[PDB]
Scaffold this active site. Structure first.
Site, PDB file in Angstrom:
ATOM      1  N   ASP A   1      -9.704  -1.167  -0.036  1.00  0.00           N
ATOM      2  CA  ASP A   1      -8.303  -1.195  -0.409  1.00  0.00           C
ATOM      3  C   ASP A   1      -8.010  -2.402  -1.305  1.00  0.00           C
ATOM      4  O   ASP A   1      -8.468  -3.513  -1.024  1.00  0.00           O
ATOM      5  CB  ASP A   1      -7.451  -1.191   0.864  1.00  0.00           C
ATOM      6  CG  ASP A   1      -6.019  -0.827   0.589  1.00  0.00           C
ATOM      7  OD1 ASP A   1      -5.760  -0.261  -0.496  1.00  0.00           O
ATOM      8  OD2 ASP A   1      -5.157  -1.092   1.448  1.00  0.00           O
TER       9      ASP A   1
ATOM     10  N   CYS B   1      -5.092   8.108  -1.709  1.00  0.00           N
ATOM     11  CA  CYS B   1      -5.764   6.989  -1.072  1.00  0.00           C
ATOM     12  C   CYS B   1      -4.777   6.694   0.057  1.00  0.00           C
ATOM     13  O   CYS B   1      -4.334   7.637   0.726  1.00  0.00           O
ATOM     14  CB  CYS B   1      -5.975   5.793  -2.034  1.00  0.00           C
ATOM     15  SG  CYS B   1      -4.616   5.436  -3.195  1.00  0.00           S
ATOM     16  N   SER B   2      -4.403   5.442   0.299  1.00  0.00           N
ATOM     17  CA  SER B   2      -3.445   5.213   1.382  1.00  0.00           C
ATOM     18  C   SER B   2      -2.021   5.382   0.847  1.00  0.00           C
ATOM     19  O   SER B   2      -1.243   6.165   1.389  1.00  0.00           O
ATOM     20  CB  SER B   2      -3.615   3.814   1.992  1.00  0.00           C
ATOM     21  OG  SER B   2      -2.811   3.671   3.172  1.00  0.00           O
TER      22      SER B   2
ATOM     23  N   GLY C   1      -1.538   6.130  -2.430  1.00  0.00           N
ATOM     24  CA  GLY C   1      -1.643   7.080  -3.526  1.00  0.00           C
ATOM     25  C   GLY C   1      -1.304   6.475  -4.882  1.00  0.00           C
ATOM     26  O   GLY C   1      -0.758   7.158  -5.757  1.00  0.00           O
ATOM     27  N   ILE C   2      -1.604   5.190  -5.071  1.00  0.00           N
ATOM     28  CA  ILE C   2      -1.304   4.558  -6.337  1.00  0.00           C
ATOM     29  C   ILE C   2      -2.382   3.620  -6.876  1.00  0.00           C
ATOM     30  O   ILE C   2      -2.622   3.610  -8.069  1.00  0.00           O
ATOM     31  CB  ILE C   2       0.048   3.784  -6.302  1.00  0.00           C
ATOM     32  CG1 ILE C   2      -0.009   2.667  -5.257  1.00  0.00           C
ATOM     33  CG2 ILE C   2       1.214   4.764  -6.086  1.00  0.00           C
ATOM     34  CD1 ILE C   2       1.275   1.808  -5.166  1.00  0.00           C
TER      35      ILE C   2
ATOM     36  N   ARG D   1      -6.093   2.981  -5.811  1.00  0.00           N
ATOM     37  CA  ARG D   1      -7.364   3.648  -6.002  1.00  0.00           C
ATOM     38  C   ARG D   1      -7.136   4.994  -6.686  1.00  0.00           C
ATOM     39  O   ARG D   1      -7.872   5.351  -7.612  1.00  0.00           O
ATOM     40  CB  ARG D   1      -8.065   3.795  -4.642  1.00  0.00           C
ATOM     41  CG  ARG D   1      -8.568   2.414  -4.111  1.00  0.00           C
ATOM     42  CD  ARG D   1      -9.012   2.440  -2.657  1.00  0.00           C
ATOM     43  NE  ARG D   1      -7.878   2.475  -1.730  1.00  0.00           N
ATOM     44  CZ  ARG D   1      -8.004   2.448  -0.406  1.00  0.00           C
ATOM     45  NH1 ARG D   1      -9.218   2.389   0.129  1.00  0.00           N
ATOM     46  NH2 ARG D   1      -6.926   2.456   0.384  1.00  0.00           N
ATOM     47  N   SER D   2      -6.110   5.728  -6.251  1.00  0.00           N
ATOM     48  CA  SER D   2      -5.801   7.021  -6.872  1.00  0.00           C
ATOM     49  C   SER D   2      -5.512   6.861  -8.366  1.00  0.00           C
ATOM     50  O   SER D   2      -5.954   7.671  -9.177  1.00  0.00           O
ATOM     51  CB  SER D   2      -4.581   7.670  -6.184  1.00  0.00           C
ATOM     52  OG  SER D   2      -4.911   8.132  -4.887  1.00  0.00           O
TER      53      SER D   2
ATOM     54  N   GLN E   1      -3.322  -0.991  -8.893  1.00  0.00           N
ATOM     55  CA  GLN E   1      -2.678  -2.052  -8.144  1.00  0.00           C
ATOM     56  C   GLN E   1      -3.105  -3.509  -8.320  1.00  0.00           C
ATOM     57  O   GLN E   1      -2.458  -4.403  -7.779  1.00  0.00           O
ATOM     58  CB  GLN E   1      -2.719  -1.656  -6.674  1.00  0.00           C
ATOM     59  CG  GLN E   1      -1.623  -0.628  -6.346  1.00  0.00           C
ATOM     60  CD  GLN E   1      -0.277  -1.302  -6.215  1.00  0.00           C
ATOM     61  OE1 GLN E   1      -0.053  -2.037  -5.263  1.00  0.00           O
ATOM     62  NE2 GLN E   1       0.623  -1.068  -7.181  1.00  0.00           N
TER      63      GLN E   1
HETATM   64  C1  LIG Z   1       5.617  -8.430  -0.908  1.00  0.00           C
HETATM   65  N1  LIG Z   1       4.647  -8.190   0.163  1.00  0.00           N
HETATM   66  C2  LIG Z   1       3.569  -9.140   0.483  1.00  0.00           C
HETATM   67  C3  LIG Z   1       2.270  -8.423   0.829  1.00  0.00           C
HETATM   68  O1  LIG Z   1       2.442  -7.440   1.846  1.00  0.00           O
HETATM   69  C4  LIG Z   1       3.435  -6.574   1.605  1.00  0.00           C
HETATM   70  C5  LIG Z   1       3.322  -5.232   2.162  1.00  0.00           C
HETATM   71  C6  LIG Z   1       4.411  -4.276   1.980  1.00  0.00           C
HETATM   72  S1  LIG Z   1       4.199  -2.653   2.636  1.00  0.00           S
HETATM   73  O2  LIG Z   1       5.584  -1.948   3.233  1.00  0.00           O
HETATM   74  O3  LIG Z   1       2.887  -2.610   3.677  1.00  0.00           O
HETATM   75  N2  LIG Z   1       3.833  -1.629   1.249  1.00  0.00           N
HETATM   76  C7  LIG Z   1       2.478  -1.635   0.679  1.00  0.00           C
HETATM   77  C8  LIG Z   1       2.324  -0.415  -0.238  1.00  0.00           C
HETATM   78  C9  LIG Z   1       0.889  -0.194  -0.627  1.00  0.00           C
HETATM   79  C10 LIG Z   1      -0.107   0.088   0.405  1.00  0.00           C
HETATM   80  C11 LIG Z   1      -1.502   0.276   0.038  1.00  0.00           C
HETATM   81  C12 LIG Z   1      -1.913   0.182  -1.371  1.00  0.00           C
HETATM   82  C13 LIG Z   1      -3.359   0.422  -1.746  1.00  0.00           C
HETATM   83  C14 LIG Z   1      -3.939  -0.386  -2.874  1.00  0.00           C
HETATM   84  C15 LIG Z   1      -5.103   0.348  -3.432  1.00  0.00           C
HETATM   85  O4  LIG Z   1      -6.017  -0.158  -4.066  1.00  0.00           O
HETATM   86  N3  LIG Z   1      -5.094   1.662  -3.179  1.00  0.00           N
HETATM   87  S2  LIG Z   1      -3.655   2.115  -2.229  1.00  0.00           S
HETATM   88  O5  LIG Z   1      -4.065   2.958  -0.921  1.00  0.00           O
HETATM   89  O6  LIG Z   1      -2.492   2.662  -3.236  1.00  0.00           O
HETATM   90  C16 LIG Z   1      -0.921  -0.104  -2.410  1.00  0.00           C
HETATM   91  C17 LIG Z   1       0.485  -0.292  -2.040  1.00  0.00           C
HETATM   92  C18 LIG Z   1       2.234  -2.928  -0.095  1.00  0.00           C
HETATM   93  N4  LIG Z   1       3.211  -3.421  -0.991  1.00  0.00           N
HETATM   94  C19 LIG Z   1       2.655  -4.620  -1.480  1.00  0.00           C
HETATM   95  C20 LIG Z   1       3.180  -5.608  -2.444  1.00  0.00           C
HETATM   96  C21 LIG Z   1       2.376  -6.803  -2.789  1.00  0.00           C
HETATM   97  C22 LIG Z   1       1.051  -7.002  -2.168  1.00  0.00           C
HETATM   98  C23 LIG Z   1       0.530  -6.008  -1.201  1.00  0.00           C
HETATM   99  C24 LIG Z   1       1.338  -4.816  -0.861  1.00  0.00           C
HETATM  100  N5  LIG Z   1       1.085  -3.741   0.013  1.00  0.00           N
HETATM  101  C25 LIG Z   1       5.624  -4.668   1.254  1.00  0.00           C
HETATM  102  C26 LIG Z   1       5.728  -6.005   0.678  1.00  0.00           C
HETATM  103  C27 LIG Z   1       4.611  -6.939   0.806  1.00  0.00           C
END
Ligand SMILES: CN1CCOc2cc(S(=O)(=O)N[C@@H](Cc3ccc([C@@H]4CC(=O)NS4(=O)=O)cc3)c3nc4ccccc4[nH]3)ccc21
Ligand SMILES: [Ca+2]
Length: 296
Positions: free
Chosen positions: A179, A213-214, A216-217, A219-220, A260
């Site tokens: 991830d 993916c998780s 969907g943005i 890795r997808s 991402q």
């Molecule tokens: C700002 N901030 C700090 C970090 O933790 C979070 C987590 C969420 S949250 O409610 O758990 N939302 C997640 C959404 C999310 C979850 C997983 C991924 C994965 C990344 C990838 O390579 N493939 S994927 O399965 O698309 C991409 C995006 C998400 N949004 C983020 C923003 C900054 C950094 C990491 C993040 N993960 C919301 C905000 C934040």
């Protein structure tokens, strides 16, 4: 493309290039995704499908699913990008696959990663224990699977219980893509991508392949960007005219946040530059990719 790659690497400006793309990305409303009744249909509150490109389920009650149609006009390919199904949206997931006439599903994550669930077990792990999705009236059976070292291909039988009609769905599961990370090498990624292509799942005679993916943005998005750019290089009179940054912005008109991290963007360049060798006629790289991927 590799000329640009060399320059960006030399300047160490990947983060800046990536940030410019994030800044320039389209921002369309996601009103339906945000309706109170759809709160439990979204895995992440900050990842929603744009209303204009969302996939609609064929049902009067609630037609919402966190999925977006990415239609790449010039490349002539469509993909449906969706989040990893939730415990309550597995039926919706397969209803979408049925209604959109998809032949393949590309999964780029594992159900559990570093001790956390990232997706529901939406397909049967055992041939003898099939699944019934009562809300959408569908039955799903694991027919067989081919397990390689870093990916598995499965043959699934999806049955519309209302009409008794059945369809074979191919499941391409990449199991070693971390991830917010990248594949072990362009070779392992391309070996997998061409496996999907060779299966016929991406043919325009079928509905759009479902990629997830998780969220969907990340890795997808990497998977789709590399595939679309390779399509364009094979189609254009001059393959050197493919601007991967422009292709990514185009894809982001359909779903937010595709790719991402700056390194996933850099990996996309590498995958396309490496993949281009096959598009230009190199008859030994495909085999080289397989050896390098150590799939056995
Ligand atoms: C700002 N901030 C700090 C970090 O933790 C979070 C987590 C969420 S949250 O409610 O758990 N939302 C997640 C959404 C999310 C979850 C997983 C991924 C994965 C990344 C990838 O390579 N493939 S994927 O399965 O698309 C991409 C995006 C998400 N949004 C983020 C923003 C900054 C950094 C990491 C993040 N993960 C919301 C905000 C934040
Ligand atoms: Ca057994």
């Amino acid at each position: 493309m590799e000329k640009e790659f060399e320059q960006i690497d030399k300047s160490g400006s990947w983060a800046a290039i990536y940030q410019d793309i994030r800044h320039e990305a389209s921002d369309f409303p996601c009103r339906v995704a945000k309706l109170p009744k759809n709160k439990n249909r979204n895995r992440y509150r900050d990842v929603s499908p744009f209303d204009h490109s969302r996939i609609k389920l064929h049902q009067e009650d609630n037609d919402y699913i966190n999925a977006s149609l990415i239609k790449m006009e010039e490349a002539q390919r469509s993909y449906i990008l969706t989040q990893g199904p939730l415990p309550n949206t597995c039926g919706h997931f397969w209803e979408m696959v049925w209604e959109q006439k998809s032949r393949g599903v590309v999964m780029l994550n594992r159900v559990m990663e570093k001790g956390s669930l990232k997706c529901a077990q939406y397909w049967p792990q055992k041939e003898e224990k099939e699944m019934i999705f009562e809300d959408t009236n569908l039955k799903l059976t694991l027919i067989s699977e081919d397990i390689k070292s870093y990916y598995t291909v499965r043959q699934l039988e999806l049955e519309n219980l209302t009409t008794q009609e059945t369809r074979e769905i191919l499941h391409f599961h990449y199991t070693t893509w971390p991830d917010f990370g990248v594949p072990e090498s362009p070779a392992s990624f391309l070996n997998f991508l061409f496996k999907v292509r060779e299966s016929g799942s991406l043919s325009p005679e079928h509905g759009p392949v479902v990629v997830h993916c998780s969220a969907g943005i990340g890795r997808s998005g990497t998977f789709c960007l590399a595939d679309t750019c390779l399509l364009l290089m094979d189609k254009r009179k001059d393959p050197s005219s493919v601007d991967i940054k422009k292709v990514l912005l185009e894809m982001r008109k359909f779903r937010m946040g595709l790719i991402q991290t700056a390194d996933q963007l850099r990996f996309s360049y590498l995958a396309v530059i490496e993949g281009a060798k096959f598009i230009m006629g190199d008859s030994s790289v495909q085999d080289q990719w397989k050896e390098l991927s150590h799939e056995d």
